[PDB]
Amino acid sequence: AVQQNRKSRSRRDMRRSHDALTENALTVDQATGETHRRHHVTKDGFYRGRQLFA
Amino acid sequence: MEVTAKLRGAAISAQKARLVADLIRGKSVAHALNILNFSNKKAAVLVKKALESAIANAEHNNSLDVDDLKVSTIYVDEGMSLKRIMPRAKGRADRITKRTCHITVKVGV
Amino acid sequence: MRHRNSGVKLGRTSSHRKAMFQNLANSLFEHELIKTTLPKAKELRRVAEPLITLAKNDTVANRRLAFARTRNAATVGKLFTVLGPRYKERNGGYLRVLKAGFRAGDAAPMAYVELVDRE
Amino acid sequence: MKRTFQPSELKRKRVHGFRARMATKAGRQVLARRRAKGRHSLTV
RNA sequence: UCUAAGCGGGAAGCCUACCUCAAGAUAAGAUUUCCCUAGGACUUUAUGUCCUCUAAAGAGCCGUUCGAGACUAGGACGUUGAUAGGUUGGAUGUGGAAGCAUAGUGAUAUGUGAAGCUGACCAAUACUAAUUGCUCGUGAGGCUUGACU
RNA sequence: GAGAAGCAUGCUGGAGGUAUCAGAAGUGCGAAUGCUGACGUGAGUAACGACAAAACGGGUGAAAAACCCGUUCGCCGAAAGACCAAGGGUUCCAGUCCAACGUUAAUCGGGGCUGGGUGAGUCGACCCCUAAGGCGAGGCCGAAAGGCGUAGUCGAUGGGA
RNA sequence: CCCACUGUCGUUGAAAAGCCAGGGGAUGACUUGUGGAUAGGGGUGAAAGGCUAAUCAAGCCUGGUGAUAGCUGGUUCUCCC
RNA sequence: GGGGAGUGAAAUAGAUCCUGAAACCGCAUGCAUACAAGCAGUGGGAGCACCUUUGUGGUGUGACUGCGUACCUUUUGUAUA
Ligand SMILES: [Mg+2]
Numbered sequence: 150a151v152q153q154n155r156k157s158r159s160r161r162d163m164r165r166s167h168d169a170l171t172e173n174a175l176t177v178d179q180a181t182g183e184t185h186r187r188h189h190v191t192k193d194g195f196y197r198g199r200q201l202f203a
Numbered sequence: 204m205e206v207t208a209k210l211r212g213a214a215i216s217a218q219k220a221r222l223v224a225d226l227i228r229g230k231s232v233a234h235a236l237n238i239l240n241f242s243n244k245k246a247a248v249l250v251k252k253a254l255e256s257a258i259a260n261a262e263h264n265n266s267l268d269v270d271d272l273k274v275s276t277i278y279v280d281e282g283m284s285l286k287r288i289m290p291r292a293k294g295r296a297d298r299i300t301k302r303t304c305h306i307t308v309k310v311g312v
Numbered sequence: 313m314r315h316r317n318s319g320v321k322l323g324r325t326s327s328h329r330k331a332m333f334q335n336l337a338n339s340l341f342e343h344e345l346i347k348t349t350l351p352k353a354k355e356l357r358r359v360a361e362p363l364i365t366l367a368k369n370d371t372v373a374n375r376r377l378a379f380a381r382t383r384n385a386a387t388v389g390k391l392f393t394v395l396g397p398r399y400k401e402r403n404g405g406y407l408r409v410l411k412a413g414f415r416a417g418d419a420a421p422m423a424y425v426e427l428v429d430r431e
Numbered sequence: 432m433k434r435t436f437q438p439s440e441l442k443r444k445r446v447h448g449f450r451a452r453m454a455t456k457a458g459r460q461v462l463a464r465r466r467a468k469g470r471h472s473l474t475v
Numbered sequence: 476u477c478u479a480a481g482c483g484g485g486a487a488g489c490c491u492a493c494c495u496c497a498a499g500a501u502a503a504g505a506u507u508u509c510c511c512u513a514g515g516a517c518u519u520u521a522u523g524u525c526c527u528c529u530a531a532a533g534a535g536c537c538g539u540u541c542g543a544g545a546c547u548a549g550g551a552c553g554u555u556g557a558u559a560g561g562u563u564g565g566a567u568g569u570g571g572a573a574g575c576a577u578a579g580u581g582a583u584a585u586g587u588g589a590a591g592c593u594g595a596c597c598a599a600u601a602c603u604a605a606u607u608g609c610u611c612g613u614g615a616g617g618c619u620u621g622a623c624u
Numbered sequence: 625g626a627g628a629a630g631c632a633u634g635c636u637g638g639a640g641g642u643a644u645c646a647g648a649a650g651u652g653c654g655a656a657u658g659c660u661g662a663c664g665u666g667a668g669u670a671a672c673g674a675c676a677a678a679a680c681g682g683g684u685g686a687a688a689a690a691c692c693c694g695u696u697c698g699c700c701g702a703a704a705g706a707c708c709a710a711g712g713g714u715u716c717c718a719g720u721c722c723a724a725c726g727u728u729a730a731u732c733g734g735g736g737c738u739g740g741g742u743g744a745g746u747c748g749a750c751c752c753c754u755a756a757g758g759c760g761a762g763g764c765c766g767a768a769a770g771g772c773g774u775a776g777u778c779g780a781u782g783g784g785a
Numbered sequence: 786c787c788c789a790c791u792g793u794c795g796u797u798g799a800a801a802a803g804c805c806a807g808g809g810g811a812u813g814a815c816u817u818g819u820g821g822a823u824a825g826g827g828g829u830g831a832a833a834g835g836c837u838a839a840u841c842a843a844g845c846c847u848g849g850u851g852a853u854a855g856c857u858g859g860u861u862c863u864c865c866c
Numbered sequence: 867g868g869g870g871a872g873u874g875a876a877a878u879a880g881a882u883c884c885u886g887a888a889a890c891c892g893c894a895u896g897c898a899u900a901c902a903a904g905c906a907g908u909g910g911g912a913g914c915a916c917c918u919u920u921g922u923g924g925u926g927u928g929a930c931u932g933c934g935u936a937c938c939u940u941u942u943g944u945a946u947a
Pocket residue numbers: 162
């Protein structure tokens with residue numbers, strides 16, 4: 150139910166050794182020149198040579 | 204020469220912000236701005252605010268060029284907590300600490 | 313186990329799920345471009361393309377089927393006058409699902425759903 | 432669950448008020464005590 | 476005289492034998508195949524450092540997904556494409572749709588017609604979505620002995 | 625220096641400190657399930673309070689799953705609707721703000737700030753009348769303090785335009 | 786409407802006594818609002834030592850009071866015999 | 867919320883504002899650490915890094931190795947589970 154001894158600050162940092170974040174897949178849409186998330190519509194509505202909500 | 208920006212009193216804990224601060228430490232300023240732009244974490248917004256402020260200070264007060272800049276230093280410290288009460292079952296009461304942080308960015312060529 | 317099973321649950325009862333997908337189909341047929349979550353968008357194809365396939369033949373039984381399945385007279389009128397004759401010579405694939413980032417208050421993956429030859 | 436307080440303002444005054452305490456000797460001693468201690472409110 | 480020397484038989488038991496795992500077996504094994512062969516300075520003089528040039532074989536991120544799955548990992552595919560959805564045909568289940576016509580006072584019955592509808596199945600089919608990409612991974616791999624050259 | 629300890633000096637600090645020899649003590653802390661404050665481990669883990677249920681388009685905004693407008697879907701309907709008494713005390717309405725408060729965000733709010741808002745011969749209270757019960761001039765009783773009670777006077781939950 | 790016989794759940798609860806599904810009484814020795822009376826060795830009790838403000842084989846608050854404890858715990862700098 | 871400018875003797879004297887300790891939590895540099903079993907020290911002792919001198923010097927780290935079951939209390943007697 151509960152610990153008998155407190156955890157050292159070393160064993161607490163050893164558990165967090167898998168807690169790191171990674172980056173996303175970002176590409177340059179040289180149809181428009183901007184940076185965008187791969188396979189996603191850009192911030193203003195562009196994708197692979199088409200524009201939504203002109 | 205490093206140019207500094209401080210964001211004192213962010214309403215997040217330092218353990219949550221250190222994860223985003225580890226992602227951009229030592230990178231070029233444009234790449235770090237991209238990483239922060241396309242993040243779903245809440246600490247990314249505050250860290251992007253502090254980084255934008257450091258770039259503006261470097262270019263206005265010190266008159267530096269931006270494509271040469273780097274995120275040379277960044278670290279997160281703890282702020283002062285807010286103490287609150289949470290009623291529990293059977294008449295018991297727990298103490299809630301609402302945590303705070305200080306973000307410090309240093310941009311340099 | 314889930315071997316070779318189709319359909320979603322999406323946290324709802326069967327009847328709520330049916331009602332929600334019918335509502336989505338009606339909204340799509342009216343506006344022709346809507347924004348939803350990606351798991352809701354990919355299951356909407358399986359609900360909304362059969363209605364267009366059905367509206368390609370304008371008989372009284374087909375229109376009564378479309379009304380039993382949409383319960384919306386404006387949608388039935390738009391299917392058998394506009395949408396059916398537009399795709400009369402297209403062999404399926406009348407929608408388009410496009411990933412569109414994440415929701416602010418939620419961090420939920422979102423998508424655009426649009427009709428193919430709109431505007 | 433029904434709890435113990437169950438307020439009524441007439442009964443509050445008739446059990447604990449100023450005239451109730453002034454109508455006996457031990458109540459006048461309650462009032463003398465509470466004036467010696469410096470309370471900002473003598474009674475309920 | 477079965478034992479002291481020497482030579483044997485003997486059980487669902489032991490070791491093999493059958494199935495599964497297994498080189499972190501730190502002694503980290505083997506076999507087939509594939510990839511990398513640019514220049515300058517330089518001194519803490521050695522698998523030494525610095526600057527331009529280079530970025531392979533491959534792996535991963537991402538996407539469409541699975542008879543694989545808690546998250547992972549693992550399998551398949553990403554336009555020179557059937558990976559998923561839809562579309563078209565088939566199969567299956569249910570059991571005689573709607574409209575119309577006829578017979579009947581009516582409930583209803585009959586014909587049109589085993590009709591209409593039919594999740595997850597089989598087969599075809601680029602109609603929709605699998606992109607223009609990015610990151611990692613280098614530039615022949617110390618020394619000493621002994622054999623072949 | 626045998627020890628409790630002492631001496632010198634760099635940095636910070638910004639106004640007091642004190643030899644020697646006597647004198648007086650709130651004179652030395654690790655423990656008392658000791659007392660007060662602060663901060664850890666558990667752990668970014670359990671949980672986010674009725675299984676009535678949501679979806680989309682537009683607006684405003686720095687930012688919208690949650691606010692406003694619209695179009696649909698769903699739930700209660702002897703209650704999850706309307707109204708009095710008690711209790712509370714401005715929560716009511718408008719403009720404006722979003723730090724804290726709201727188990728998430730909030731542009732919203734029963735939150736902050738600035739103004740506004742409750743109109744009676746007939747509704748109610750007060751008022752006249754009394755029940756139970758209280759207090760009670762004189763009076764009876766009691767070391768004192770005090771107890772009971774007559775005439776009276778109060779006291780609605782009941783009677784009176 | 787008043788009650789509380791059984792069971793599952795809940796037991797750092799939605800809750801310091803509940804929910805849900807069933808259960809009993811339901812014109813009476815009934816249920817209930819408002820006001821009042823009884824006060825601690827006392828009251829009240831179709832009686833279980835029950836209740837008397839989440840407290841009952843003698844309520845709570847202040848005082849006597851720093852009660853007493855042949856019991857348990859704790860007791861702080863250095864050196865020498 | 868900060869960065870310049872400006873005030874002031876002083877701004878890590880800037881309003882949570884004299885001084886600013888410890889527990890606790892970061893970032894940076896050096897060395898060690900992914901074939902090895904236990905109160906984490908102690909006696910040895912190689913290597914590396916930085917200062918310095920021409921060192922049988924100083925500072926940090928510590929491969930490998932002998933020995934080694936916390937403190938208080940109470941007990942005949944406690945690593946004591
Ligand atoms: Mg650390």
